[PDB]
Amino acid sequence: MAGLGNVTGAVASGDSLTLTLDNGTSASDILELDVLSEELLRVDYRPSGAAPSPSTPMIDPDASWDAVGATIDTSGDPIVVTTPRMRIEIARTPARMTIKKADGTTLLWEPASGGVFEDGVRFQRGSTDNIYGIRSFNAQEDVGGLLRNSSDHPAHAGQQGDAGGPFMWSTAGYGVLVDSDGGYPYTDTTGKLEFYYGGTPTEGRRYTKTNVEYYIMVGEPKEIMASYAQVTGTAPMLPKWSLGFMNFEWGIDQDELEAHVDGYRARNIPIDAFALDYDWMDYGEDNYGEFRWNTDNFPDAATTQLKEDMEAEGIRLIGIRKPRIITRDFANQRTQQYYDADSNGYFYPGHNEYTDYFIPVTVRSFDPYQQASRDWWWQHSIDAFDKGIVGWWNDETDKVDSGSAQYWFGNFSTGFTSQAMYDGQRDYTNDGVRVWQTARSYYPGAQRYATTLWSGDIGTQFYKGELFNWAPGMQEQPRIMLSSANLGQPKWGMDTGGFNSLGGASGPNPSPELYTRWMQFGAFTPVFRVHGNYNQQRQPWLYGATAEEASKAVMHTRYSLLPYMYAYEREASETGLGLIKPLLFDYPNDPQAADYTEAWMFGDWLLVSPVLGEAQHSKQIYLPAGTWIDYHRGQTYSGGQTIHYPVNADTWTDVPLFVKQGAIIPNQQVLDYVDQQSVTTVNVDIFPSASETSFTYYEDDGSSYDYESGSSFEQRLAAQDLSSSVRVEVGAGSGSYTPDVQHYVLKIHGRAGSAVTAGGSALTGYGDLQALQAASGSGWASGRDIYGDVTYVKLPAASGSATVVEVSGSAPSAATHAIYEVEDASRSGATPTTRAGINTNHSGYSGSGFVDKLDVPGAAVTVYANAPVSGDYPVELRYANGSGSAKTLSVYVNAARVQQLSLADTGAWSQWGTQTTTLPLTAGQNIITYKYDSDAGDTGGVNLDYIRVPFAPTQAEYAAESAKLWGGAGTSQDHWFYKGAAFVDNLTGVGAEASFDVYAPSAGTYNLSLRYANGTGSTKTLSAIVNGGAASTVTLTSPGMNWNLWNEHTMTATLTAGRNTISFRRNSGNSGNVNLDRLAVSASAITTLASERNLLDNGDFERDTTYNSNWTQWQPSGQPSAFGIDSGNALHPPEGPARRNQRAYFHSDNAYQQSIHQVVDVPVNNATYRLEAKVRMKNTTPTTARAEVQGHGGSPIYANISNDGVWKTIVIDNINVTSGSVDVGFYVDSPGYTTLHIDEVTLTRAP
Amino acid sequence: VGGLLRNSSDHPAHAGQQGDAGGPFMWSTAGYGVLVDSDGGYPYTDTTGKLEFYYGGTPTEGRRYTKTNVEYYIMVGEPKEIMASYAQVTGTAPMLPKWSLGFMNFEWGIDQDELEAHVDGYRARNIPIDAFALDYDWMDYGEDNYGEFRWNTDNFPDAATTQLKEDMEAEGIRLIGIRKPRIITRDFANQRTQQYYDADSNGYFYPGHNEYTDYFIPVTVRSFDPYQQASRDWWWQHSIDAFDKGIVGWWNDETDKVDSGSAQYWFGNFSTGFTSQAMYDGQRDYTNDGVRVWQTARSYYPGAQRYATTLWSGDIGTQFYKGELFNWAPGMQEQPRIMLSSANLGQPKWGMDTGGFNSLGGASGPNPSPELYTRWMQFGAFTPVFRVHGNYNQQRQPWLYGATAEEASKAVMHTRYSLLPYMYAYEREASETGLGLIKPLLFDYPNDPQAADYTEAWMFGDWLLVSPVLGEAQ
Ligand SMILES: OC[C@H]1O[C@H](O[C@H]2[C@H](O)[C@@H](O)[C@@H](O[C@H]3[C@H](O)[C@@H](O)[C@@H](O[C@H]4[C@H](O)[C@@H](O)[C@@H](O[C@H]5[C@H](O)[C@@H](O)[C@@H](O)O[C@@H]5CO)O[C@@H]4CO)O[C@@H]3CO)O[C@@H]2CO)[C@H](O)[C@@H](O)[C@@H]1O
Ligand SMILES: OC[C@H]1O[C@H](OC[C@H]2O[C@H](O[C@H]3[C@H](O)[C@@H](O)[C@@H](O[C@H]4[C@H](O)[C@@H](O)[C@H](O)O[C@@H]4CO)O[C@@H]3CO)[C@H](O)[C@@H](O)[C@@H]2O)[C@H](O)[C@@H](O)[C@@H]1O
Ligand SMILES: OC[C@H]1O[C@H](O[C@H]2[C@H](O)[C@@H](O)[C@@H](O[C@H]3[C@H](O)[C@@H](O)[C@@H](O[C@H]4[C@H](O)[C@@H](O)[C@@H](O)O[C@@H]4CO)O[C@@H]3CO)O[C@@H]2CO)[C@H](O)[C@@H](O)[C@@H]1O
Ligand SMILES: OC[C@H]1O[C@H](O[C@H]2[C@H](O)[C@@H](O)[C@@H](O[C@H]3[C@H](O)[C@@H](O)[C@@H](O[C@H]4[C@H](O)[C@@H](O)[C@@H](O)O[C@@H]4CO)O[C@@H]3CO)O[C@@H]2CO)[C@H](O)[C@@H](O)[C@@H]1O
Ligand SMILES: OC[C@H]1O[C@H](OC[C@H]2O[C@H](O)[C@H](O)[C@@H](O)[C@@H]2O)[C@H](O)[C@@H](O)[C@@H]1O
Ligand SMILES: OC[C@H]1O[C@@H](O)[C@H](O)[C@@H](O)[C@@H]1O
Ligand SMILES: OC[C@H]1O[C@@H](O)[C@H](O)[C@@H](O)[C@@H]1O
Ligand SMILES: OC[C@H]1O[C@H](O)[C@H](O)[C@@H](O)[C@@H]1O
Ligand SMILES: [Ca+2]
Ligand SMILES: [Ca+2]
Ligand SMILES: [Ca+2]
Ligand SMILES: [Mg+2]
Ligand SMILES: [Mg+2]
Ligand SMILES: [Mg+2]
Ligand SMILES: [Mg+2]
Ligand SMILES: [Mg+2]
Ligand SMILES: [Mg+2]
Ligand SMILES: [Mg+2]
Ligand SMILES: [Mg+2]
Ligand SMILES: [Mg+2]
Ligand code: NI
Ligand code: NI
């Protein structure tokens, strides 16, 4: 903010004066004065004499003046420039300009304190001078006058009729013009006249200048304005017709235009032009519609006829133009104009796609408060109801928001709108079709008219402020749901996936992660629904195989629970209490339940706590008083504590779900929809408590209000754990509805009885659940499941009298495996009529049948199998192959392709064999799929009978990142070659630790293997603490100064049956400073885990793209990279990953070559390896697109990728590695607009 | 989004909007509840132990049920008992169809072919689903004859009959349809609708809610960059056909700022000049300097005048002055100050929407009165770019405003057109000095304090001083 220094040199030449100014350096400042006319001076200040920047488009590039012949006198102090109209004085010490009229009258001057400087100009002038220019006023502003005597408004073009610029002038005889892209003029009534470049203005700044170029005008206003036009340009003459009257109009076609023109002409009212708004053009359409005449409105503009006919009537035509293009037509297709603009870089910088509206309609709110209004509303809805609208999604019964229209609906508007449909539909159908509605507000009483509540236009984000601050996201929704429950509206839902994004409907869809977690959450809420903004899609398969399979899996859980859930729908008709409730309902006196919203009750007997955090590796879950059983993993927890709950961030398969001891949970086979068939057997899972508990099973027609006059069915089920037996009562049937249920299968957990009695009779024992299910009439059986010992009891439902069953004794099963009959499992395929099938037409099968039709591409069967801990499970597949030769099927686990199974001929279709494969299962639910994947080279063509899954793994694994971290230990992805989603780092402070919860079947000595990195260069130590016992030293050598190298530390530990704690901690004697990845646990020697076969780093591209990986890239010198990694969720529709959250892409709009490569040293040289990957190609066919294996000892091996649009598996087998390393890669040569996606790349040791 | 606790609450009891819920219901896990019968109002709690509820003043949402008595309910029990007693007083919930426990796919942007494809995709994969909900897509919203209640058979051909319902039912799919508590009162062709006549004659509109202009058909757009020569060449190239077929003047709107939902993008200060340059350079090249360029824009920055553009004052109000009918846009009386401010910045080629653009209720709001229209026309005739404009489907022909508006408009128009050779000399002057057809008095009288901020009269060329009557009933 300092002024210029002393003049140290002055060089006159013609009409120019060049001053050198002292700034205390060898690169002195330069001030160039040029006398352009007798009354116009140009000044160019160049800090340190640097070359001037280009002038902005303010300046006329062709401006030209005659020689003035000014007198420049540098002989004294001040230096003096004179013309007949002005006298410019520059004082030497320091340099300050004074501008005067030729007669010596002072106009303006640079004050002592400072004039021109690096960021602007500063003048002083008469305090009473009137200043003009700078700014005008827009159509949304208070409109001031002409005077600018106390102004700090910026210089800008502005909006809505505004005008402005760096031009300040006075009627006292001077003007100042500064070349600038925006900036900040300043005036006040002490006499300041200043202009600052300042910070980037609101409108942006695309022309920056290091010099300060300005112009000083002397004269009367007309002379000042003429000088302004000399500098910035005069105006070209408009056509003479433009002095005439013009009629601008919006809402006009050719007939109306002709009528208007006739109207003027008939009346001798002169007029020269009509201006046509949107009407004239095909705005919204492809092929440059926003430049094309709309021949529906103006038929004669198909040719020059309209122009010529209007010209003959003396009418010229003006057309509205918007500085934008339509990037999606009315059918949601990318337009030609989009492709052209996008490929050439013609979009305004910083301006993304957005939603416009240009077709107005006029509307007015109806009043639902009036009975006659409600009758009318209903009467006009009957036709839509008859033709299929059987649920009413009543939107915007709350508030209008449109321009000046900001109207509120009253508090009873939702209730009354709901009443209109409720009363109407009930009368019209004679109470024969139940009403379903949703609204986005609730007020007491509205519930009488059969309406749910949804949470409105929530944001597509994890939480409020993650991506934008103006709407809450997923994490807030439990608090909204439970607040609604606390107001007596438990029938609640949300837009799963979110509605709003940055950029409106064109903004991004949820990431696959956000989508998957939101679906798991929504499945345990009352009104389970996806929604999105205009032309957004929310189908689960669009978000990749994890989202698809995890969403499917949790939906199967929800539908299996239909009989459980439906009792709560009945309960809401009696007490208003519904399917969800906050913990505080059950625990009014528990302070940790008082505000608790991260978990809630789903019915009376299940506590759910969905994983809602991005990249979440574990959860802290408050369990209130009682005993809780993990639904998916089987272990028990005592209540009244916060538990640490490991989750697998790699698979997304966990939905933390806990059975409340006392639970009686009716459940059934999974249907595609609620009345797809009659369910004649209802399972009842019972977890007995020492106090009696009960659940009243309920059926009715699901459809009418017949239940109101007694047409329903119920049976009270009750249970109690006694000193040495369990008693279960199935009460007498009650009510007039004949239920579909014929038998209950009681699954009584916690005891495998030696006898089951009822009414003086010991029930007939059967060998297993299958034999019991096949028996007519009552019986029992026993077994083992994930929870432990279980007793099965099959009984008739709907008896007129109560049945009391008692399970006594203890005779635990010796079974080592669970059996899953695949005919009971999930059958899918490419189309609804090409799904895998059920059959019985060959003998020798277990259970009720086997699965066939695995001989059309895409046919599959999926089993949901629970595991107590993560690890290796050898899973046996029973199958038949009477084809004459071996056949292949893919086995997928948690959406990853684990192996191609080669299934040998079994000699005949009625002869069965078994294939056992070690599967990497995760703790809790696992998704095991056997599929005919023709695009991976499978043949299909076998029949499958069942799988057998061991209750215990051969060896277990526990991820460090999911362990309980303390003392500064954290998770990270900032080094290479970790397993799972992350590793543990920052074991630096004393007390830093990772504590694992390890499960053992029996007391004894177990082997441990701890995967760790130590890149310090020297041996480091931690302590191992088992079950809080004495610390033992863990000594961890360093393989060198490289944090991408991992090793195993082996040791043993003495464990007890059940849960053990094993902590690795920096105690005060220890050095720490290692990273931990995984703890493996076995009774035998530990070998490579099935989950850890992949030799590549970041082969699945799942790493946060802030962090790098062992992948490298290449493109031709001079070409921009065509490669990146993201989720594909910004696209409409999404182009998702093959698995989990992310995939690599190659894409450019113009011709390109691109590769990525990764080199790894193999563990065993002179051995065979195998590359597998998922690849998808779309859009333009490239010249070359391939996977590549090279550097292995042999010549390059190629596998081509062909343009389809679908994910395919590419395999390069039999890689004979003799060099000790392999380069795997992907390469594309494209003429332009080829998209390749790459995901799930694995390099493994192959037999 | 807060928590569940309401220990220090003064938020009103209302239905609210956008997923909200509320009511005069305040209860505790300490063993009691209070329910007050009320239409809105003001519950109050604090940590000194207050549990209060006030009817108070009329809330934001209105109040249509007022009460002189105070009716309330006290509940005693554990939370489930309190909630059961709440349901006794305010009602239990009717059982919903059993299919509503299933998964539902809601969707906006869907027709029959896509719905069938979605359902097939779920069924093929054994992903359970019971219902699809259809947005605007399902109905003829915007059309006459109760279009906002009627199936859209362009999107859903089989909903001409019960066929769609029955085929979807066969696949285990129930259909939900979106409803808006409003009717279209003017269809796409600007005709009053049957549903308007029926609602209006029976008094079925929400009290206090006047009709208003709304939009429902989205389009996706993106701003072009006029700063780049290649972009300007492209923009002009695609304009040639329109020009050949009669668009000889370029009304360049919205070169200033985008305003759409979250999209609030500014164009830079040279956007008007460069947009203008695209058409100017292009048209001059294409016609070999044979056809003069005419343009208008709604912003100005120095230098833009080189490319043959005028300036108009934007979406001004149909009113005499700012705050006459509404406060959010200026009216007629402010316009001379805007015109003369533009002149002081070297852009004297200025115009305005004579008649005004904006009204209360948007496009469906009132036209100018005959008086406003007549005076505005007289004013406009002594300004440089003389033009009427109005909002969507509004009309500005002078004969629609009665014989005084017609005859007085005609008369002043005859004066303007008689002055063509006077005016045209000033058009030539602007090519030499930038000075145009209008100027404030202070250009001629720089030392007169009475002229220093004077805008109620101005010079029309050098030799005429004009002072239009702009006051109502003046
Ligand atoms: O004497 C009575 C008078 O006093 C008070 O005003 C005086 C100020 O308090 C005082 O600071 C001084 O103001 C100077 C200022 O110090 C100086 O920096 C300059 O201000 C420029 C910025 O330098 C320039 O960057 C630009 O600022 C932009 C900014 O870049 C942009 O990022 C954004 O934030 O907007 C800003 C503009 O709003 O422009 C400003 C000028 O607007 O010059 C100032 C004026 O010389 O002197 C003031 C009196 O002269 C009282 O407040 C005032 O009412 C009384 O009349
Ligand atoms: O690499 C240069 C590239 O960077 C930016 O885009 C990165 C983007 O690239 C890929 O997206 C492609 C799709 O794969 C193509 O299918 C195509 O998508 C369009 C699709 O064909 C239409 O049907 C759909 O409705 O609209 C989309 C366009 O929105 O084009 C996009 C590129 O725009 C890749 O799959 C993505 O993961 C990745 O984010 C930059 O935006 C590009 O302009 C640039 O070329
Ligand atoms: O952890 C955060 C870091 O993340 C990124 O680091 C990457 C690098 O980009 C890779 O180059 C590689 O680094 C290796 C390195 O290649 C290897 O030579 C070795 O480096 C030693 C070095 O030999 C030794 O003399 C001394 O300088 O220490 C180095 C390391 O401690 O080992 C590196 C790995 O440890 O992989 C890492 C990720 O592990 C990012 O680029 C870094 O800026 C960032 O710090
Ligand atoms: O104990 C702490 C506080 O106690 C005191 O506040 C009192 C007020 O004095 C009472 O008047 C009352 O406030 C009510 C008010 O009576 C009632 O009308 C309503 O106010 C509405 C208003 O009607 C409406 O038009 C709009 O303006 O919003 C208002 C609500 O914000 O509701 C009020 C309660 O919220 O009760 C309170 C609390 O007992 C004391 O004055 C405070 O300073 C003190 O902090
Ligand atoms: O492809 C495996 C398949 O082989 C036999 O069936 C062949 C063929 O028989 C009928 O035509 C069926 O309708 C088709 O679906 C079959 O492809 C075995 O009988 C069958 O069990 C096995 O799955
Ligand atoms: O009808 C279009 C949109 O309108 C909004 O008011 C609703 O809240 C959305 O659910 C709906 O998709
Ligand atoms: O195109 C519709 C309307 O768009 C607005 O941005 C313009 O300012 C109006 O003059 C025009 O009638
Ligand atoms: O000191 C130990 C730490 O050293 C380095 O910062 C490593 O990047 C980190 O992984 C490790 O935890
Ligand atoms: Ca079987
Ligand atoms: Ca790990
Ligand atoms: Ca991936
Ligand atoms: Mg010269
Ligand atoms: Mg003064
Ligand atoms: Mg600078
Ligand atoms: Mg019209
Ligand atoms: Mg005619
Ligand atoms: Mg057309
Ligand atoms: Mg769609
Ligand atoms: Mg079909
Ligand atoms: Mg129709
Ligand atoms: Ni402004
Ligand atoms: Ni609220």
Automatic annotation (TrEMBL), chain A:
PANTHER family: HYDROLASE, PUTATIVE (AFU_ORTHOLOGUE AFUA_1G03140)-RELATED, MALTASE-GLUCOAMYLASE. This is Glycoside hydrolase family 31 alpha-glucosidase. The keyword Transferase does not apply. SUPFAM superfamilies: (Trans)glycosidases, Galactose mutarotase-like, Galactose-binding domain-like, Glycosyl hydrolase domain. Ca(2+) 3 binds at D1100, E1102, R1139, Q1142, D1239, E1240. The gene is 6gt31a. Belongs to the glycosyl hydrolase 31 family. Mg(2+) 9 binds at D1229. Mg(2+) 5 binds at D282, E285. Mg(2+) 1 binds at D119. Mg(2+) 2 binds at E249, G251. Mg(2+) 6 binds at D342, D1149. Coiled coil: none annotated.
